[PDB]
Amino acid sequence: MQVADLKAFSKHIYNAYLKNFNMTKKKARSILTGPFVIHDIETLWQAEKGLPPYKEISVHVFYRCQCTTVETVRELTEFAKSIPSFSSLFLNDQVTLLKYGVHEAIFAMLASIVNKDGLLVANGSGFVTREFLRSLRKPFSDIIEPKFEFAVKFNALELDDSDLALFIAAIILCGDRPGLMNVPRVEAIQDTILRALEFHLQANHPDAQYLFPKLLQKMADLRQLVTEHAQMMQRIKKTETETSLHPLLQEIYKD
Amino acid sequence: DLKAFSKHIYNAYLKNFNMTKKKARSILTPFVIHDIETLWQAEKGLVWGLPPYKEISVHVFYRCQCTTVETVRELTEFAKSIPSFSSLFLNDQVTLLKYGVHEAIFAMLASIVNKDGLLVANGSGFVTREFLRSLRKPFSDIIEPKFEFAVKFNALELDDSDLALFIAAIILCGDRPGLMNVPRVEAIQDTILRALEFHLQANHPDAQYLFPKLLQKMADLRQLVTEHAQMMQRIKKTETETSLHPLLQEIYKD
Numbered sequence: 001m002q003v004a005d006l007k008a009f010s011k012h013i014y015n016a017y018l019k020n021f022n023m024t025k026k027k028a029r030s031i032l033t034g035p036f037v038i039h040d041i042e043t044l045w046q047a048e049k050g051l052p053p054y055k056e057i058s059v060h061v062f063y064r065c066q067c068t069t070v071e072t073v074r075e076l077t078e079f080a081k082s083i084p085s086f087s088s089l090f091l092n093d094q095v096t097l098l099k100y101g102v103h104e105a106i107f108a109m110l111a112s113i114v115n116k117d118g119l120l121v122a123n124g125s126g127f128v129t130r131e132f133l134r135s136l137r138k139p140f141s142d143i144i145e146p147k148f149e150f151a152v153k154f155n156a157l158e159l160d161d162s163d164l165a166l167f168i169a170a171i172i173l174c175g176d177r178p179g180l181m182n183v184p185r186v187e188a189i190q191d192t193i194l195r196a197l198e199f200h201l202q203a204n205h206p207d208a209q210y211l212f213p214k215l216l217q218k219m220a221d222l223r224q225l226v227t228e229h230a231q232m233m234q235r236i237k238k239t240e241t242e243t244s245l246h247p248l249l250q251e252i253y254k255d
Numbered sequence: 256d257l258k259a260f261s262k263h264i265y266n267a268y269l270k271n272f273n274m275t276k277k278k279a280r281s282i283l284t285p286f287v288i289h290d291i292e293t294l295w296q297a298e299k300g301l302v303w304g305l306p307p308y309k310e311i312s313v314h315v316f317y318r319c320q321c322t323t324v325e326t327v328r329e330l331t332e333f334a335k336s337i338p339s340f341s342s343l344f345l346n347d348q349v350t351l352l353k354y355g356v357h358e359a360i361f362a363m364l365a366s367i368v369n370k371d372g373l374l375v376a377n378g379s380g381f382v383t384r385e386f387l388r389s390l391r392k393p394f395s396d397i398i399e400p401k402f403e404f405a406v407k408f409n410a411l412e413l414d415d416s417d418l419a420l421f422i423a424a425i426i427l428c429g430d431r432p433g434l435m436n437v438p439r440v441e442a443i444q445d446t447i448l449r450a451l452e453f454h455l456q457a458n459h460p461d462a463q464y465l466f467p468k469l470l471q472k473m474a475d476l477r478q479l480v481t482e483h484a485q486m487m488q489r490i491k492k493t494e495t496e497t498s499l500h501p502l503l504q505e506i507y508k509d
């Protein structure tokens with residue numbers, strides 16, 4: 001695959017990204033820099049004016065992280081389907097890739113609707129302050145704060161949508177997911193994306209130093225972020241018998 | 256939209272292939288090569304950069320080579336004229352020719368062939384199927400299979416205009432290894448097949464079941480070339496004096 005092929009590869013992947021996600025970084029930045037601030041119980045309740053029956057604040061906020069996560073999984077599945085060589089993989093490989101890398105994607109993208117004071121919710125019509133989310137009882141708060149920690153260090157790399165389209169595709173087409181059927185083919189496609197990614201960054205961030213290796217580490221940082229997250233998800237599955245989990249996320253944390 | 260599609264692709268054919276089925280039939284109906292004499296005579300009394308002569312079958316084998324290589328360049332130019340093949344990834348363009356040229360070359364073999372042999376030397380010579388059977392193994396086993404096929408496929412009584420489309424659907428197979436953009440190739444294929452489908456209806460009205468028989472024929476050729484690549488391996492191993500044009504080492508490497 002030539003430099004030109006990879007250039008055209010990026011217009012394709014970017015197009016899939018624009019067609020498919022409702023919230024780009026362009027739409028978010030412009031909103032953030034100038035929605036309803038949800039900073040406490042009065043504000044949440046107001047902002048509420050089909051989730052499980054409301055039990056308690058920390059828990060209902062938990063359920064809204066579920067309603068948002070679910071929505072994004074569907075977005076990425078579509079996004080994955082529009083990646084050039086993905087529709088043409090074993091379906092078992094298509095599911096395994098989604099099942100193991102969607103959460104890395106979600107948290108890489110969450111950085112985009114995040115800043116240091118909180119995040120945009122509800123298609124950018126709401127804003128939940130970092131503080132208020134810090135204030136829900138453990139173990140919910142302790143599942144939310146590390147993702148913020150990550151995001152703030154990641155928006156420092158100052159990436160745009162056309163860069164995130166490739167970063168994200170690189171994460172889904174990861175050929176180390178366990179139980180893959182055709183590992184070398186995935187590894188092919190992945191490598192073609194990290195190559196297209198390498199050239200894109202030369203064009204679009206030419207003074208930027210060391211960007212590519214910086215990005216590969218954050219890929220690794222994400223694996224453990226998800227590892228540390230999945231752990232906590234399991235701790236909720238056990239310590240919080242009353243609290244439920246959408247069956248779409250039941251089959252994700254299945255194995 | 257489909258009828259225009261056909262005329263275009265047919266023009267790419269006549270532009271790019273010197274020997275069409277039409278030329279080939281109206282001769283078949285040339286100097287016969289049937290033995291060592293006629294061949295050595297052909298080789299001195301027909302004019303058509305070869306390895307120093309080692310033996311007769313190896314020489315025949317390098318002739319096959321001389322020719323398959325030349326047709327691989329024709330199929331290459333020809334594809335540059337199948338609509339939107341040029342606007343695929345150049346690495347996909349390569350992957351399609353590499354894995355598809357031979358299926359193409361043997362579909363087209365049937366055009367210059369009959370039961371008794373093939374035309375050679377751009378129409379000047381005729382080589383009997385007997386003489387080619389005559390040669391020693393592995394060189395006999397490589398040849399005959401094509402002939403069966405060429406004969407049975409010929410009984411479908413296609414013309415060039417059908418061929419020019421069949422050819423393209425064969426190149427445009429989004430089922431090759433290492434294809435980045437599968438569903439784009441599948442879609443150009445789809446258009447080609449629909450065009451060949453309407454073409455057939457228009458060209459061969461009373462003919463029942465012609466199009467689906469064509470799709471098995473496209474299947475058949477993948478298997479044939481699978482056995483042909485198997486067989487070539489036998490020759491990279493056992494015919495160790497006997498070289499292979501670099502361009503073919505390229506296509507077979509994997």
Ligand SMILES: Cc1cnc(-c2ccc(C(F)(F)F)cc2)n1Cc1ccccc1OCCC[C@@H](C)CC(=O)O
Pocket residue numbers: 060061062063064065066068069106107110120121128143144145147148233249
């Ligand atoms: C990615 C995301 C996008 N929007 C939200 C989000 C919007 C509004 C509200 C609410 F308004 F309820 F506060 C809560 C959250 N999040 C969740 C989010 C953000 C920052 C830190 C941790 C987050 O969730 C971790 C827990 C998610 C799991 C329940 C489900 C799973 O893991 O699959």
Ligand SMILES: Cc1cnc(-c2ccc(C(F)(F)F)cc2)n1Cc1ccccc1OCCC[C@@H](C)CC(=O)O
Pocket residue numbers: 314315316317318319320322323324360361364373374375376382397398399401402503
């Ligand atoms: C397609 C074709 C067109 N013309 C010839 C041909 C013309 C003149 C003479 C002669 F007799 F002169 F040597 C031999 C052959 N052929 C070859 C052909 C015909 C019928 C059956 C098997 C055939 O080749 C299989 C072997 C091809 C490989 C060496 C290289 C490769 O696999 O790419």
